């Protein structure tokens with residue numbers, strides 16, 4: 273015979289979505305299946321490509337957090353805990369998991385996680401900003417560098433004397449200033465005429481390296 | 486000095502029925518137990534087993550057989566996880582972890598990829614583009630670009646450092662694009678004119694390189 277607590281750890285996070293930088297994140301974790309008041313509960317950030325990171329946690333007597341802008345709290349009659357992160361930035365994107373510590377009490381304890389909820393932080397809107405366009409070359413590779421535009425929607429095309437070059441592909445990312453920059457890569461002989469042409473908010477911007485006068 | 490866990494290589498690719506050894510170099514250890522968690526798309530991350538370094542004992546959690554997953558000791562006080570008789574359903578990200586008080590600290594994870602298709606690993610082919618005069622003239626700043634192409638699997642880690650600093654710089658990274666047996670990724674670093682004279686180092690890791698990063702120097706000369 274063995275004696276074990278009768279319990280299942282059910283955790284369901286909600287509140288995820290796309291947020292603007294500077295806003296406050298508010299997440300809820302609905303729990304069930306185990307004795308709520310006496311439990312130990314935490315929030316972890318799982319961003320793809322990074323180490324899962326502890327953010328904050330709490331029980332009935334104490335709470336702690338990794339930063340001042342991060343806090344958690346409890347609603348006992350509903351068996352819920354909450355997460356609040358003020359002043360969101362791009363680094364706060366990822367999958368937020370509610371976690372419960374389970375085990376004997378020592379360093380053999382495990383975390384049980386819920387499915388989590390996805391948070392995407394994007395720059396806060398600001399005045400439209402047309403990009404600048406620069407061509408760069410290395411042997412038969414051409415990069416088209418597109419710097420500091422807002423909003424993110426644009427259309428890019430690399431062409432050699434009027435026709436689309438092969439193996440074009442576009443990479444786009446936010447910067448720290450709340451704008452976007454982007455690189456469009458293609459393959460073309462180092463002596464071919466090349467034009468990079470960008471359309472953004474109905475304006476056309478371009479750079480070309482001519483092969484003749 | 487703060488507990489930290491290191492995991493390399495960043496990925497392991499296998500066919501079915503093979504096995505895989507995952508590495509965890511744990512530094513400034515504060516605990517006797519090394520924990521192994523698994524993450525799969527759309528599933529809750531969960532712990533597979535816990536290993537006591539002192540007692541050299543590997544204890545699987547319910548649902549996991551010691552025949553299937555088993556931790557043991559390795560060179561330089563390294564904990565290693567062996568996953569036997571690989572099936573496609575084993576693919577995912579495996580993190581080692583350690584308790585540090587009420588806080589659990591996790592390694593960055595190694596991605597196990599199990600596929601039933603024939604494959605060959607292929608290392609990134611890097612292509613560098615350097616700041617152009619026109620960019621400096623128009624923006625008082627310059628963008629370094631590294632394109633890594635034609636690698637397999639679709640897992641890669643890249644970072645930029647400047648000499649004298651050891652925090653990665655705030656570079657932009659594009660998505661990993663491609664399919665089949667050929668993926669690529671571009672990253673780029675825009676810096677102010679003062680930093681255009683300083684020396685930079687560019688690093689990448691990939692499973693076809695094994696554990697050691699490749700590093701390139703970018704300097705004035």
Ligand SMILES: *[C@@H]1O[C@H](CO)[C@@H](O[C@@H]2O[C@H](CO)[C@@H](O)[C@H](O)[C@H]2NC(C)=O)[C@H](O)[C@H]1NC(C)=O
Nearest residue numbers: 648649680681682683684685702703704705706
């Ligand atoms: C970046 O590294 C290069 C060397 O790789 C440095 O160039 C040297 O500069 C010193 C003067 O400080 C000269 O005496 C050497 O002859 C140079 N060597 C070479 C190979 O060019 C350069 O100074 C470094 N840049 C910075 C900002 O430290």
Ligand SMILES: *[C@@H]1O[C@H](CO)[C@@H](O)[C@H](O)[C@H]1NC(C)=O
Nearest residue numbers: 310312330331332333334587
């Ligand atoms: C709450 O957590 C703190 C910090 O880990 C711990 O010291 C304390 O004993 C816990 N209290 C309860 C009631 O579990």
